[PDB]
Amino acid sequence: VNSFSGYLKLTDNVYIKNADIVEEAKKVKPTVVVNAANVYLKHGGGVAGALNKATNNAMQVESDDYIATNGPLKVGGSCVLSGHNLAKHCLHVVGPNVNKGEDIQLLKSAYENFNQHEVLLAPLLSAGIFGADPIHSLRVCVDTVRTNVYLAVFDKNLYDKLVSSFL
Numbered sequence: 001v002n003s004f005s006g007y008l009k010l011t012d013n014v015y016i017k018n019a020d021i022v023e024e025a026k027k028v029k030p031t032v033v034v035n036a037a038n039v040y041l042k043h044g045g046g047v048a049g050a051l052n053k054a055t056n057n058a059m060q061v062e063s064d065d066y067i068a069t070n071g072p073l074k075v076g077g078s079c080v081l082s083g084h085n086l087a088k089h090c091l092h093v094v095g096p097n098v099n100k101g102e103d104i105q106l107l108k109s110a111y112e113n114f115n116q117h118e119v120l121l122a123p124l125l126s127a128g129i130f131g132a133d134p135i136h137s138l139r140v141c142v143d144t145v146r147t148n149v150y151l152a153v154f155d156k157n158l159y160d161k162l163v164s165s166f167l
């Protein structure tokens, strides 16, 4: 039993809700919140900009030190950093950005990072400003993630389409 509330169950291990991931993280304080990161951990917009804003820019400060030490992530890769006031940990995961020409096949590799964590609060990878089809992202999530994932979908209209079209 966990503290996630109001989710629709899609499969044995995948759950979904129309919610603002920032507000959901602040309420649940999950062990792991997933950020829709880029390789530079520049949290300017989309989910990343919103999560970083909610940390009063502390996520960005920590991220800049991480990059200065380690260099950029790989597309499809991840790193674990602090969750600040939102979660114990933040798993920064880089899905391919279609608006940069990156290979959508890397979306499966991106979701594989979730399997290193027993339970996660997450957005749909590569959705939103990353330019992928969210219906496809949900399919890859369900077919790749084996651990317990609670998906927050900000847009109510998109949430309803994802549920109604889910096979």
Ligand SMILES: C=C(CCO)c1ncnc2[nH]c(C)cc12
Binding pocket: 019, 020, 021, 022, 046, 047, 050, 123, 124, 127, 128, 129, 152, 153, 154, 155, 158
């Ligand atoms: C990709 C999106 C935008 C939906 O079109 C998203 N997904 C999950 N949580 C979110 N929180 C905010 C503030 C945007 C957001």
